[PDB]
Amino acid sequence: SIALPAHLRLQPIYWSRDDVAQWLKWAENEFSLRPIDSNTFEMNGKALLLLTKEDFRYRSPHSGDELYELLQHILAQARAVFDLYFVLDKSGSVANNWIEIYNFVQQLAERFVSPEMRLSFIVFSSQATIILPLTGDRGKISKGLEDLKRVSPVGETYIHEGLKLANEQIQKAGGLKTSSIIIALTDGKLDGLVPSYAEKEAKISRSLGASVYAVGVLDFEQAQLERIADSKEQVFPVKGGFQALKGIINSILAQ
Ligand SMILES: [Mg+2]
Ligand SMILES: [Mg+2]
Numbered sequence: 088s089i090a091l092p093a094h095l096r097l098q099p100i101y102w103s104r105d106d107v108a109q110w111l112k113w114a115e116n117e118f119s120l121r122p123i124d125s126n127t128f129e130m131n132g133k134a135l136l137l138l139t140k141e142d143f144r145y146r147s148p149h150s151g152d153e154l155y156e157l158l159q160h161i162l163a164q165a166r167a168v169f170d171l172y173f174v175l176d177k178s179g180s181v182a183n184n185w186i187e188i189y190n191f192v193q194q195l196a197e198r199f200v201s202p203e204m205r206l207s208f209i210v211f212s213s214q215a216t217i218i219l220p221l222t223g224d225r226g227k228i229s230k231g232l233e234d235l236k237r238v239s240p241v242g243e244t245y246i247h248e249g250l251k252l253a254n255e256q257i258q259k260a261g262g263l264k265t266s267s268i269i270i271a272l273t274d275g276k277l278d279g280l281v282p283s284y285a286e287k288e289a290k291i292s293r294s295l296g297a298s299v300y301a302v303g304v305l306d307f308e309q310a311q312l313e314r315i316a317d318s319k320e321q322v323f324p325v326k327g328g329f330q331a332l333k334g335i336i337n338s339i340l341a342q
Contacts, residue, residue, distance in 0.1 A: 088262075089117060090296055096168060096264040096342060099161060102132030114150075114157060121149040136162075161263050166202040167223055169339050170265045171195075172253040172297075176273035176304070177210045177240040184304060185240050187325060188272050191302070193232055194329050195270075199336055200225050205265070207256055208235055211249030212242030221256050244277055246315070247284035250292060250299075257295045266339055267297040270332065272325070274304050275311035282311060289315045300335075302328045 091113065094106050102110070108125045115122055127146050128135060135158070143151035173192050181188065196206055201223075208219035208231050218238075219231030253269050261267045269292055277285060292299050301312035301322040312322045323331050 088294065088296060089113070090262075090266075091264055093342065098166065099132040099136060099158060102135070104129065104131045107132060107135055111154070114154060118150075118153065118157075120153065123147055123150060160260075164205075164260070164264055165223075167205045167265045168203045168342050169336065170205045170207070170221060170257065170261050170267045171199075171336070172207045172221075172256065172267065172269045173209060174246070174249040174253055174269055174271040174273075175208070175210045175235075175238075176212070176244060176246065176249075176271075177238050178212045178242050178244040179240060180244065180274055180276060181304060182240040185238060186236075188304060189232075189236050189238075191272065191325055191329060192235060195332060195336075196228055196232060198333060199340070200228060203340060204336075206231070207253065208232075209249050209252045210235075210238055211244075211246060212240065213245060214242070215245070215248035215252050217252055217256075221260055244273065245281060245284075246271065246273055246275075246277065247281065247288040250285065250288040254288065254291050254295060254297075257292070257297055261295070261297075267295065268335070268339070269297055269299045270302060271299065271312075271315065272302045272304055273312070274306065275301070275308040275315070277308075277311060282314070285311075286314050293317060300332070302332075 095110050107128050140155045143155040175188055205221050205223040206228050207221040210216055210218055218234050257267045289299050299316050301316035303312055303324050313319050316322045
């Protein structure tokens with residue numbers, strides 16, 4: 088699950104011949120492929136995009152099709168370098184404080200909407216729902232915010248179901264050149280065996296290379312959020328949470 092090198096976080100069209108060779112090495116290790124010569128693709132990225140899938144299969148009978156499809160997924164992420172997932176609590180306990188949550192997500196979304204950022208809105212209570220599938224399209228983001236404002240909080244606090252939806256997206260569309268951060272807004276008041284499920288799911292987030300941040304609403308349980316987020320420093324209240332994250336994002340945006 089090693090991330091793509093920084094040189095290779097750029098669009099393939101800007102890749103150098105050295106980059107293409109480095110890309111082939113990374114894949115060999117990432118996908119346990121039959122090793123190939125560094126001179127299998129003796130060209131730059133622009134040239135690589137002109138090859139057909141047949142050309143990939145001819146140059147690498149054992150890995151060509153897989154390499155071609157790996158490249159298609161990279162091209163699909165386009166300029167995305169940072170995937171941001173909002174896991175929002177919509178349990179009964181926040182029915183009278185949802186606008187605060189919405190405003191928080193709204194401010195961050197309007198702040199960093201750009202070609203390099205893709206957004207996903209997830210809400211959770213007794214069930215979890217994807218309000219906005221991961222997208223950097225500003226129109227879809229604007230519609231997703233409208234849907235988010237219309238949410239009526241009801242139900243229990245099953246945050247592990249919310250974290251899963253993000254993990255799922257990260258597994259399918261969220262690797263390669265994109266860094267994934269998950270922002271979970273909740274009071275962290277869990278019942279029964281939910282605390283274990285939530286920490287287990289959060290560990291799967293970190294195993295996918297995702298950094299988990301916990302923004303606490305209401306009288307939030309500090310201890311619980313510290314076990315969900317990566318660290319105590321990644322757990323901060325809503326007040327001043329906009330300023331905090333703005334920086335974390337801006338720093339990651341530096342690539
Ligand atoms: Mg709750
Ligand atoms: Mg609050």
